[PDB]
Amino acid sequence: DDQVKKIDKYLYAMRLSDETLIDIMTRFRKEMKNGLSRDFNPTATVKMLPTFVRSIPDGSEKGDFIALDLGGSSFRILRVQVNHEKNQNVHMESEVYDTPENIVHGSGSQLFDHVAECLGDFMEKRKIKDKKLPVGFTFSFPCQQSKIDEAILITWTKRFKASGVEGADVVKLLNKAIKKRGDYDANIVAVVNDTVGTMMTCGYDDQHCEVGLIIGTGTNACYMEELRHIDLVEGDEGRMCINTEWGAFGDDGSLEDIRTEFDREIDRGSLNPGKQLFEKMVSGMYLGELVRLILVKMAKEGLLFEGRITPELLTRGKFNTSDVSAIEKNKEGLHNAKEILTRLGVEPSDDDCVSVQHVCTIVSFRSANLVAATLGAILNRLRDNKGTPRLRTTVGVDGSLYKTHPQYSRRFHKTLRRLVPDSDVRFLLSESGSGKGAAMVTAVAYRLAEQHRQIEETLAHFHLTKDMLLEVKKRMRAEMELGLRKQTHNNAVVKMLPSFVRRTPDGTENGDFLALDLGGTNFRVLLVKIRSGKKRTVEMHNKIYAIPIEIMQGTGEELFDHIVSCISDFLDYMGIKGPRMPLGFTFSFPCQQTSLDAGILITWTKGFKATDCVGHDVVTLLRDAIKRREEFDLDVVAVVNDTVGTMMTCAYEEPTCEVGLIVGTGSNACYMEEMKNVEMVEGDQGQMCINMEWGAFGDNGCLDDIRTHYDRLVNEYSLNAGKQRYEKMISGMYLGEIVRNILIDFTKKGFLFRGQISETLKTRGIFETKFLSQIESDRLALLQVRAILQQLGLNSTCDDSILVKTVCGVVSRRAAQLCGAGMAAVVDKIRENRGLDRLNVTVGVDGTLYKLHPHFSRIMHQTVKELSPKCNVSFLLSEDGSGKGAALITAVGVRLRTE
Amino acid sequence: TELKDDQVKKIDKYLYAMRLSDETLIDIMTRFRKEMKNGLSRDFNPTATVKMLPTFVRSIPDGSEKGDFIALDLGGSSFRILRVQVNHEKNQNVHMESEVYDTPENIVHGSGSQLFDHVAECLGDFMEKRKIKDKKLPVGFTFSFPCQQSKIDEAILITWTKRFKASGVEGADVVKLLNKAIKKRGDYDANIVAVVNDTVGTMMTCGYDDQHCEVGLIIGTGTNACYMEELRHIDLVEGDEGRMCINTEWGAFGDDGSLEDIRTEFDREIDRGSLNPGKQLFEKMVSGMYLGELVRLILVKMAKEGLLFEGRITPELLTRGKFNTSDVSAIEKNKEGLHNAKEILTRLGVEPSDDDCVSVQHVCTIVSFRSANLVAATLGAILNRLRDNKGTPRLRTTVGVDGSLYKTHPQYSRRFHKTLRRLVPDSDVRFLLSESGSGKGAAMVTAVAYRLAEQHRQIEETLAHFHLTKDMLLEVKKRMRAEMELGLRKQTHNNAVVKMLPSFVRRTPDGTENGDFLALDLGGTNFRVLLVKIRSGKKRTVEMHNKIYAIPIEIMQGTGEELFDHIVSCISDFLDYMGIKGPRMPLGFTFSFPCQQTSLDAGILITWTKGFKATDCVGHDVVTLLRDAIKRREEFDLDVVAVVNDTVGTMMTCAYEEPTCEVGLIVGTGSNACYMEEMKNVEMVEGDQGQMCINMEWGAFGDNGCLDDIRTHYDRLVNEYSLNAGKQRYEKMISGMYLGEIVRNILIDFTKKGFLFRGQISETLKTRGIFETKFLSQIESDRLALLQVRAILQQLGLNSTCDDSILVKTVCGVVSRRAAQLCGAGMAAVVDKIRENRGLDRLNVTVGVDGTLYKLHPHFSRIMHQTVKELSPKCNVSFLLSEDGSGKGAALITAVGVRLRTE
Ligand SMILES: Nc1ncnc2c1ncn2[C@@H]1O[C@H](COP(=O)(O)OP(=O)(O)NP(=O)(O)O)[C@@H](O)[C@H]1O
Ligand SMILES: Nc1ncnc2c1ncn2[C@@H]1O[C@H](COP(=O)(O)OP(=O)(O)NP(=O)(O)O)[C@@H](O)[C@H]1O
Ligand SMILES: O=P(O)(O)OC[C@H]1O[C@@H](O)[C@H](O)[C@@H](O)[C@@H]1O
Ligand SMILES: O=P(O)(O)OC[C@H]1O[C@@H](O)[C@H](O)[C@@H](O)[C@@H]1O
Ligand SMILES: O=P(O)(O)OC[C@H]1O[C@@H](O)[C@H](O)[C@@H](O)[C@@H]1O
Ligand SMILES: O=P(O)(O)OC[C@H]1O[C@@H](O)[C@H](O)[C@@H](O)[C@@H]1O
Ligand SMILES: OC[C@H]1O[C@H](O)[C@H](O)[C@@H](O)[C@@H]1O
Ligand SMILES: OC[C@H]1O[C@H](O)[C@H](O)[C@@H](O)[C@@H]1O
Ligand SMILES: OC[C@H]1O[C@H](O)[C@H](O)[C@@H](O)[C@@H]1O
Ligand SMILES: OC[C@H]1O[C@H](O)[C@H](O)[C@@H](O)[C@@H]1O
Ligand SMILES: [Mg+2]
Ligand SMILES: [Mg+2]
Ligand SMILES: [Mg+2]
Ligand SMILES: [Mg+2]
Ligand SMILES: [Mg+2]
């Protein structure tokens, strides 16, 4: 007939069995799964939050760190000093600062003003204001972080409820507050939950610590999870700590069969009704009020105090968790119950004291059992990830209920071992709270922010502003004008070369021509059939022929014999071997022409370098190889640059096309100039197409104040050291070499590739256009970026791959902007020479970089639009190669060699 | 003996690298198998050479297809145009009429504009010769090139292959381009409803006859295959039920050098002279456009070495194209082969001897046999995949087949079918030859896509009713604005459905309010009792306490004494709870319903709104029913000072700190607004001095008819079935009690019409309340995978499939979007009126807002704000969320109460 048996029955639904706890554990096991999944997280109640902490301390941290801890029973500020090598050591000093009701419940401003004022005082009294120490912030609330130094508040919990904070990044709110008080500056470099710092504190001393557990004012746990299971973070290597935020378990109604009427009543008086329901059955802030609610009910039904209620009894908060602890002490518990109940006014009896003990017992054991169940789900997940029959792991713990209750921990530990027999757990109690740990994470964040600081300074040398880009355009304009004028031309670096093509296609062109395409990525021999009139037709055919690097860099004479010999192969293939036919020679090197069919090679560019060609007439060299072969005669009527033939191609259909552009292996442009402006050729009537040879802009030092160390290495290790400087910042032959030298540096500083500069990274050309374009594609995910780097031969991690991509982007973006600033100049010079206010002009373009890069063309058109706002430029991609155009121009010789 | 080599043995040695054994083909098959898998996964598709592309064709014809439609066939050897009729449920079987339009080189190679103008021209003529311009026939477009499709009537050209190379088309959607040509012409109208691949058309043509058909196979000018994949394995398509045909684009197998070990010098020289070098490399080893050049290349090199023609080489033998694949066919003929070889070679000028003919036949046989072996290896991979998706030991399947080479070569199909069967011994395959083209099949697709678009068109037509144009929104503001005036005018309180009720709060807070107040919160989601301590010091502070109390609907819609007797047990309980029973205390009553007020501390209930309907309330003073229940209790005592609308309480809360906040907005269970109005304008309150907060009772807008215009079938149904038919009409197109009832009604309809829920209206869909503010908020969130939208709906009890889940989410956004715009028209009026009232040119104002819908909905608050900024462009309105309920605000008003009193 005992009183204890009655209560057991009264509170039957709080006495959880092992079967119910095994059931709780399975559900928690599914919530974790839900929260890690990209599919189910948006609705999961157990947020499974990434912490950006990747391991427990490794003994290599050193420094002097200020650390804040706000969110649990006290607000503290610690100064943690840690040094190794030598002798043994981590020193901490800290201060508790009060935070009243008006602060925790006020505006977010008032709270952070409050925080920055205790920080100021803290450093003030120790005199460390100027010692500029990195700050670590233990803020114990669920925050969404994409990096270690952002903390976006998802939702208040426990006792805090300040306006203006939820949804905001509280490190910017903190900075704002500190900024607001000019007193000092603070480098806030990390935010961490109290579970993670706990784990990090315990992990400094115990290498198998993989869990951090808080059973205090609130409850939570964090654990080391595999990167390849955390869908919301990109990577699959190693592990990252996760903040479960288990307090929220049941917030969608899944524990409704466990929660009692006392739990529903507590929730309604709470400062967050509906939320953190598992936490409300477990943590210190609630248990006292839970028993109080049960005592009022038993009291109202005459089962306690022979039914006497007092106001005190009925008052929220009048029974603490510290009274539930005192009441459960072995020798003194009953003496403590009488004093306290006596203080509440119910004139307690000895039976009432044993009854109030029994109730305290069932509430706190229900708490103990519940966290055994969610903690064991975590251990079953750790053990499953590991692949092992048994699991040995250490859980770092902290919290006031955990520390001060005289039965809890023991009860908790026993249940755990029953629920999870295949796991052996050591509990390590955080004697001095979480500062050591937070400090340890602050040290790693700090070393990383420094490495970020340095990559950004290197990369910012590639950044051009509007104002910068307007100065390049303006220099380009001053340079076209010196190459054009008779007095300045010989010393000019941008030669403004006459091509002798005097108009765009006029619809009369007719005939069957041969063409050559030499100087881009493939050499071709072409046959183009053009028919003017009613039904206008163009019929093309072509054959690719390789040219060994031996030949490209052999003798002029091996080069041209090799050329004619594929011509001869090609005339067989088209069934036209015998007849004498006219040919247009698209040769994409700077040529000084005195007519359409003459072209003296000024200098090689790009990868070509045959001997005895520079200084000669390439039409001559070709005609000596034909005669030399003595197989067929040919009639070479025209030497053409790929820009001009590209413009001619695109203008066959588009009369507004007066500009050509190439961005492929090299970069260059042509455009229609007025003859009055071409002082180097006699005559003022009409126009002429000018082959700018814009690659050579900067060859007199005029872009030096924008060229980088890496641009100087690529130029100095080139086949034409000192020349085609602009092209060298823009085209497909050189961008990858820029990117490769940047990566070489970064590797030597340890930022990439584990600091190991390999044989792959030392090989020239590893980053060709095709790979540069893919790596940067919005079509690819980091995963596929990494796989590209690996097939190139690089030992690249996910972090490495994120940085290679950023690099590629910086260099490719700068190339499109530099290319846009020069095109800007050209269109402005045409518009404004014509007296026009608004020019619409079409540019015909070709080249593999331009065709294959996913960003270049968009950024370039944007640049042209921003710097030359009175020109409306259209870019028309030529899909057929340069041949049609050389063919159209070739028809113009013929006619003129035919007079 | 010791056998000595003859021509034939020597040529097998010369061309060893083309003679591929069962071991090498099993290696290729397995490579192809990994490339398909590679193509279907999201982790490797972006760099895959086998694109494994989605076609939107979910199955082979089932025989319900009926109707009449055109069908364009572009990209094989002939540009054809068909007419296809079927409708068996009534008599007449499929019947096919076609033409064939000569398309010249200069077109296949000119601009895309020339190309599509020519196709447009041909369609026109073909429509006149038949006299059908005027019928409105659905059009199908078999376009045999790799294309990215996000739906059946889009086809973005990835790349040209085979013979075509028209500029300005790649990257562009050939449907756009065709329409654009058609448009420019004028002759007729074309409804193009679908683009398929000649593989998919083949599979469907053959499936129409054999329901076992799962593969479409093309070995003609080009080669490709398509097959039915489990939507579970198509990562680039969102969905996991049933199947979808995949068009592999196996021609590009090996682009990336993964076939560089089987490719030879002959295949590397052919690539050098083709229209797309570096592309379609496996196709270049197999298909009709290439087999003839491949033989010619071998013959030139054999002639140069003296193995053929005693070393003679003529200019014909050296010329691209002079030996074609129909030459390879004629030479491989059983009887007449060697004699065909004689003629063909003599026209090449080479004076062929009889040895030379036997040699050439043999090279032709090795080249064409390698091609047949290759397609057997890659089909072998597709068949094994099919067997592994079924989970059987054996597979049974039909392959539908088309292409000139397969049809005309005398030996090919035989050796193909044979090597195939030997490579896949556990499969029982039938090969069905699409005797007459891919048009029957394309027509069957066009027919399923046409029916689907009629549904889509009818869903859009219902939904367009919820779409509000900027001048309609503007007319709604002007309408809101005219009702404001009416409700203020002493003589117009009638068709004054918008009452403009005076709150008797004459100013916002003024740093002097001080004290300990009880407050009550009745009308929203929770009934709460509060303790609010305000101190004015040099330390301005606010301390809040509250407790939620349920109201069991046996009190909600029960009596008034029984409703207030309850409020007052709960007040009694809250004072014990807070430890303050005893002290006579002042109370602020936030009561979220329309009331006529003669002062701060009295208010007669005008009507029940929202969910409340307790009897003996309307026409009574609530502060009087409150006072009675307190006397019935004859326990404690308090001093009721103020009765306040949630609206006025939220504004005041928010203004406790922000002097700009002169407006209050509620969007939760119901919707309402308040603002500070000038007293010269409040005609019903004597005094022309100062200001006054007006509780608009804005939800009643449209109660006289002035929104009838924008109200839909679904809005009238929600209203007719409500506790208060005829009223709070504007509130009924906005708030969270009513939004999901509109959606529910939309879904009921669409389900009767068969567009959704397999057409069954279930007990779940017919339950009021199913679509709560919490699920509408989740359903419409932007971080939602479609798998999750489905899960939720199934959680609710709805048997939703992927596509149902797509239209339920589109229905929710349409409703919730109209709700935020309508709200913003309303707020645009309030803020333009306050500006106007003050003869200002520009107004800066802040609205304090609360409400579960405003808080939880992903888009609502962002669209309302946009709306207000676009319709009152001279006002600059900031909105501040009330994070802790309007109790602070009611308390502040209770502070003024007590002042203005006990003066
Ligand atoms: N699952 C449970 N939930 C609530 N109360 C429980 C539960 N299990 C046991 N109790 C109570 O806990 C007390 C004893 O537990 P405890 O002393 O910690 O265990 P023990 O030392 O292993 N066994 P014991 O000999 O009973 O003391 C008694 O008051 C039991 O009624
Ligand atoms: N794997 C292979 N690759 C290339 N050529 C092959 C291969 N296997 C066999 N051949 C040749 O294929 C020919 C045999 O063709 P096959 O279809 O098996 O019979 P057939 O002689 O053409 N039949 P028939 O019509 O009765 O005369 C011989 O000339 C073989 O040298
Ligand atoms: O203060 P409690 O809620 O009892 O929790 C105790 C612990 O809580 C954490 O919030 C703090 O990071 C710890 O350093 C503190 O020791
Ligand atoms: O091949 P790239 O160097 O990228 O340049 C690509 C283009 O190069 C020019 O030099 C050729 O004349 C064009 O016909 C070719 O389309
Ligand atoms: O025309 P071929 O390339 O030889 O291919 C044969 C088949 O080609 C497809 O592209 C057409 O859509 C079919 O109707 C045709 O019968
Ligand atoms: O509860 P809802 O109807 O969503 O609107 C929420 C709000 O509405 C009001 O009626 C209450 O006075 C506010 O304190 C509450 O925050
Ligand atoms: O402080 C203990 C726990 O308290 C609450 O659960 C917080 O939401 C959580 O972040 C914290 O770790
Ligand atoms: O091919 C693009 C350009 O490459 C280099 O710039 C050549 O000097 C130039 O003439 C050619 O136009
Ligand atoms: O026409 C047969 C096949 O030819 C080509 O390979 C096309 O790329 C393909 O889409 C078509 O199915
Ligand atoms: O609760 C928001 C609004 O709900 C209904 O519209 C009530 O009639 C109104 O008084 C309240 O302000
Ligand atoms: Mg991951
Ligand atoms: Mg026990
Ligand atoms: Mg001149
Ligand atoms: Mg899928
Ligand atoms: Mg008045």
- What values do phi and psi take at B228, rounded to 5? -90, 115
CA–CA separation, A776 and A796 (whole Å): 16
Contact B753, B458 (CB under 8 A): yes
Q: Two tokens at A298?
A: 């038993």
Q: Look at residues B792, B713, B695, B799 and name the one whose alpha carbon lies nearest to residue B756.
A: B799
Q: Give DSSP secondary structure letters for A614-637.
A: TTSBHHHHHHHHHHHH-S---EEE
Q: Look at residues B648, B619, B607 and name the one whose alpha carbon lies nearest to residue B504.
A: B648
Question: Are B787 and A39 within 8 A, CB to CB?
Answer: yes
Burial class (CB in 10 A: 0-12, 13-18, 19+), A257: exposed
Q: Look at residues B320, B331, B346, B317 and name the one whose alpha carbon lies nearest to residue B408.
A: B331
Residues 6+ apart with CB under 8 A from B85: B67, B68, B92, B94, B95
Query: Does a structural domain hold residue A79?
Result: yes
**Catalytic choice (B153, B356, B621, B646):** B646
Q: How was this structure determined?
A: X-ray
Query: Does a structural domain hold residue A635?
Result: yes
CA B150 – ligand 9 centroid, Å: 19
Domain CATH for B116: 3.30.420.40
Q: Two tokens at B433?
A: 């030859």
Q: Two tokens at B773?
A: 């503010």
Contact A318, A340 (CB under 8 A): no
Instruction: Specify the DSSP class assigned to residue A534.
Output: S
Residues 6+ apart with CB under 8 A from A876: A650, A654, A657, A842, A843, A844, A845
Instruction: Enumerate the residues of chain A whose CB falls inside 8 A of the CB of residue B539.
Output: 102
Residues 6+ apart with CB under 8 A from B391: none
Query: Does a structural domain hold residue A461?
Result: no
Question: Are B541 and A102 within 8 A, CB to CB?
Answer: yes
User: Does B47 contact A at CB distance below 8 Å?
Assistant: yes
User: Among positive and negative, which fits the CA dihedral A288, A292, A293, A297?
Assistant: positive
B714 and B679 assigned to the same domain: yes
CA B283 – ligand 14 centroid, Å: 29
B670 and B804 assigned to the same domain: yes
Assess whether the C-beta atom of B216 lies below 6 angstroms from ligand 5.
Answer: no
DSSP strand pairing (A143-144 vs B95-98): unpaired
User: Among positive and negative, which fits the CA dihedral B426, B431, B432, B438?
Assistant: positive
Final residue before a domain boundary, out of A386, A415, A448: A448
Q: Look at residues A539, A767, A588 and name the one whose alpha carbon lies nearest to residue A693.
A: A588
Residues 6+ apart with CB under 8 A from A364: A287, A324, A328, A401, A405, A407, A408, A411
Q: Two tokens at B59?
A: 């199955």
Closest protein CA for atom 12 of ligand 3: A194
Beta bridge partners of B643: B589
CA–CA separation, A644 and A885 (whole Å): 8
Q: Give DSSP secondary structure letters for B289-314.
A: HHHHHHHHHHHHHHHHTTSSGGG---
- What values do phi and psi take at B841, rounded to 5? -90, -25
Q: Two tokens at B353?
A: 């001897």
Establish whether B528 is a catalytic residue.
Answer: yes
| CA distance readout (Å), B68 to B85, B94, B127, B131, B450 | 5, 10, 13, 14, 11
User: Which ranges of B634-785 would DSSP assign to H, the alpha helix?
Assistant: 646-655, 713-720, 729-732, 739-752, 773-779
DSSP H/E element including A526: strand A523-531
A49 and A169 assigned to the same domain: yes
Q: Which residue shows structure tokens 């903690």?
A: A375
Give B346 to chain A, closest Cα distance, Å. 17
User: What angle do helix axes A18-36 and A408-419 make, rounded to 10 degrees?
Assistant: 80
| Closest CA in chain A for residue B550 | A268
CA–CA separation, A663 and A537 (whole Å): 29
Instruction: Specify the DSSP class assigned to residue A58.
Output: -
CA–CA separation, B530 and B325 (whole Å): 92
Q: Two tokens at A664?
A: 């492929």
Q: Look at residues A338, A339, A175, A156 and name the one whose alpha carbon lies nearest to residue A247.
A: A156
- What values do phi and psi take at A478, rounded to 5? -75, -25
Q: Look at residues A392, A396, A381 and name the one whose alpha carbon lies nearest to residue A200.
A: A396
A119 appears as a binding residue in the annotation: no
b/e per residue A402-422 (b: at least 16 CB within 10 A): bbebebbbebbeebbeebbee
A316: domain range? 1-38+208-430
Q: Look at residues A740, A790, A782, A793 and name the one whose alpha carbon lies nearest to residue A762.
A: A740
Which of B318, B545, B781 faces A42 most closely, judged by CB atoms? B781
Assess whether the C-beta atom of B417 lies below 6 angstroms from ligand 2.
Answer: no
User: Which ranges of B763-801 would DSSP assign to H, the alpha helix?
Assistant: 773-779, 786-796
Q: Look at residues A790, A580, A824, A584 and name the one whose alpha carbon lies nearest to residue A694.
A: A824
Q: How many CB atoms lie within 10 A of CB B839?
A: 6
Q: How many CB atoms lie within 10 A of CB B836?
A: 12
User: Which ranges of A724-855 would DSSP assign to H, the alpha helix?
Assistant: 725-730, 735-748, 759-762, 769-776, 782-792, 798-833, 848-852
Query: Does a structural domain hold residue B308?
Result: yes
Q: How many CA atoms lie within 13 A of A663 on its CB side?
A: 29
Q: Look at residues A484, A832, A829 and name the one whose alpha carbon lies nearest to residue A678.
A: A484
| Closest CA in chain A for residue B787 | A39
Domain CATH for B317: 3.40.367.20
DSSP strand pairing (A657-663 vs A667-674): antiparallel
Mutate to test the pocket of ligand 9, among B198, B246, B276 (most ligand atoms within 8 A of CB): B198
Instruction: Enumerate the residues of chain A whose CB falls inside 8 A of the CB of residue B581.
Output: 311
CA–CA separation, A150 and A129 (whole Å): 23
A404 and A438 assigned to the same domain: no
Query: Does a structural domain hold residue B338?
Result: yes
Residues 6+ apart with CB under 8 A from B625: B560, B561, B563, B564, B617
b/e per residue A699-719 (b: at least 16 CB within 10 A): beebbeebbbebbebbbeebe
User: Does B425 contact A at CB distance below 8 Å?
Assistant: no
- What are all long-range contacts of A714-719, with beta carbons under 8 Å and residues at least 24 apart? A714/A738, A714/A741, A717/A764, A719/A604, A719/A607, A719/A609
CA–CA separation, A693 and A618 (whole Å): 17
| Cα angle B220-B225-B227, degrees, rounded to a multiple of 5 | 150
Q: Two tokens at A89?
A: 């050591």
Question: Are B315 and A575 within 8 A, CB to CB?
Answer: yes
Give B717 to chain A, closest Cα distance, Å. 32
In ligand 8, the atom with minimum distance to the C-alpha of A695 is 6
CA–CA separation, B229 and B207 (whole Å): 15
Instruction: Specify the DSSP class assigned to residue A697.
Output: T
B146 and B65 assigned to the same domain: yes
Q: SS3 of A92, please?
A: strand
Q: What ligand is nearest to the CA atom of residue A17?
A: 1
Please state the domain count of chain A. Answer: 4
Binding site of B for D-glucose 6-phosphate, by residue number, is 73-80, 198, 221, 402-404, 438, 521-525, 646, 669, 850-852, 886
CA–CA separation, A504 and A507 (whole Å): 9
Contact B388, B33 (CB under 8 A): no
User: Which ranges of B637-738 would DSSP assign to H, the alpha helix?
Assistant: 646-655, 713-720, 729-732
User: Which ranges of A181-240 would DSSP assign to H, the alpha helix?
Assistant: 194-205
A563 and A614 assigned to the same domain: yes
Final residue before a domain boundary, out of A430, A456, A477: A430
Contact A501, A688 (CB under 8 A): yes
CA–CA separation, B803 and B750 (whole Å): 13
Question: What's the maximum distance between 2 C-alpha atoms anywhere in chain A?
Answer: 131
| Cα angle A525-A526-A527, degrees, rounded to a multiple of 5 | 140
CA A847 – ligand 4 centroid, Å: 5
| Closest CA in chain B for residue A316 | B577
Range list of β-strands (E), B751-815: none
Question: Are A777 and B320 within 8 A, CB to CB?
Answer: no
CA–CA separation, B719 and B707 (whole Å): 13
Residues 6+ apart with CB under 8 A from B526: A273, B548, B549
Q: Look at residues A637, A209, A623 and name the one whose alpha carbon lies nearest to residue A434.
A: A209
Chain A / chain B CB contacts < 8 angstroms: 109
Closest protein CA for atom 5 of ligand 4: A847
B676 and B622 assigned to the same domain: no
| Cα angle B395-B401-B406, degrees, rounded to a multiple of 5 | 120
Contact A244, A212 (CB under 8 A): no
Contact A577, A694 (CB under 8 A): no
Instruction: Enumerate the residues of chain B whose CB falls inside 8 A of the CB of residue A316.
Output: 545, 577-579
Contact A130, A195 (CB under 8 A): no
Q: Look at residues A173, A71, A76, A174 and name the one whose alpha carbon lies nearest to residue A122.
A: A76
Contact A280, A238 (CB under 8 A): no
B283 and B422 assigned to the same domain: yes
The gap from C-alpha A414 to its chain's centroid, in whole angstroms, comes to 46
A75 appears as a binding residue in the annotation: yes
A597 and A698 assigned to the same domain: no
Contact A320, A285 (CB under 8 A): no
CA–CA separation, B515 and B323 (whole Å): 105
Assess whether the C-beta atom of A364 lies below 6 angstroms from ligand 1.
Answer: no
CA–CA separation, B336 and B339 (whole Å): 5
Contact B155, B149 (CB under 8 A): yes
CA–CA separation, A21 and B480 (whole Å): 59
Beta bridge partners of A733: none
Amino acid residing at A76: R
User: What strands lie across the sheet with B661-667, from one edge to the other?
Assistant: B501-502, B691-695, B671-678, B661-667, B843-850, B875-881
Give B66 to chain A, closest Cα distance, Å. 40
User: Does B783 contact A at CB distance below 8 Å?
Assistant: yes
Beta bridge partners of A585: A516, A639
Q: Two tokens at A418?
A: 């029953």
DSSP strand pairing (B395-402 vs B427-433): parallel
Instruction: Enumerate the residues of chain A whose CB falls inside 8 A of the CB of residue B235.
Output: none
CA–CA separation, B408 and B798 (whole Å): 55
Q: Two tokens at B255?
A: 């682009």
User: Which ranges of A260-349 would DSSP assign to H, the alpha helix?
Assistant: 261-268, 279-282, 284-300, 321-327, 333-343
Compute the radius of gyration of chain B from its Cα atoms. 40
A182 appears as a binding residue in the annotation: no
User: Does B542 contact A at CB distance below 8 Å?
Assistant: yes
First to last CA, chain A: 131
Query: Does a structural domain hold residue A309?
Result: yes
Q: Look at residues A106, A112, A135 and name the one whose alpha carbon lies nearest to residue A123.
A: A135
Establish whether B592 is a catalytic residue.
Answer: yes
B490 and B590 assigned to the same domain: no
Instruction: Specify the DSSP class assigned to residue A223.
Output: E
Q: Two tokens at A290?
A: 């839970």
Amino acid residing at A177: A
Give rounded-to-5 percent helix, strand, coil for chain B: 45, 20, 40
Q: SS3 of A503, please?
A: coil
DSSP H/E element including A841: strand A839-846
Q: Two tokens at A313?
A: 């009894």
| CA distance readout (Å), B605 to B287, B622, B732 | 85, 7, 20
- What values do phi and psi take at A835, rounded to 5? 80, 0
In ligand 9, the atom with minimum distance to the C-alpha of B76 is 1
Residues 6+ apart with CB under 8 A from A300: A307, A309
Q: SS3 of B878, please?
A: strand
B540 and B644 assigned to the same domain: yes
Contact A556, A608 (CB under 8 A): no
Contact B664, B847 (CB under 8 A): yes
Q: What ligand is nearest to the CA atom of residue B11?
A: 2
Contact A157, A279 (CB under 8 A): yes
Question: Are B541 and A106 within 8 A, CB to CB?
Answer: yes
Q: Give the residue from A631, A784, A845 with the most B CB atoms within 10 Å of its CB, the best one to mutate.
A: A784
Q: How many CA atoms lie within 13 A of A701 on its CB side?
A: 0
Instruction: Specify the DSSP class assigned to residue A216.
Output: S
Q: Which residue shows structure tokens 């072409």?
A: A526
Question: Are A43 and B788 within 8 A, CB to CB?
Answer: yes
User: Among positive and negative, which fits the CA dihedral B100, B101, B105, B110?
Assistant: negative
Instruction: Enumerate the residues of chain A whose CB falls inside 8 A of the CB of residue B543.
Output: 101-102, 105
Question: Are A653 and B783 within 8 A, CB to CB?
Answer: no
Query: Does a structural domain hold residue A455?
Result: no
Q: Which residue shows structure tokens 């943690």?
A: A80
Q: Two tokens at B426?
A: 């556990």
Instruction: Specify the DSSP class assigned to residue A702.
Output: T
Q: How many CA atoms lie within 13 A of B385 on its CB side?
A: 27
The gap from C-alpha A749 to its chain's centroid, in whole angstroms, comes to 20
Give rounded-to-5 percent helix, strand, coil for chain A: 45, 20, 40
Query: Does a structural domain hold residue A454?
Result: no
Assess whether the C-beta atom of A279 lies below 6 angstroms from ligand 3.
Answer: no
User: Does B109 contact A at CB distance below 8 Å?
Assistant: yes
Q: SS3 of B173, please?
A: strand
A796 and A833 assigned to the same domain: yes
CA–CA separation, A772 and A664 (whole Å): 13
User: Does B636 contact A at CB distance below 8 Å?
Assistant: no
| Cα angle B826-B831-B832, degrees, rounded to a multiple of 5 | 95
Resolution of the experimental model, in Å, one decimal: 2.2
CA A239 – ligand 13 centroid, Å: 72
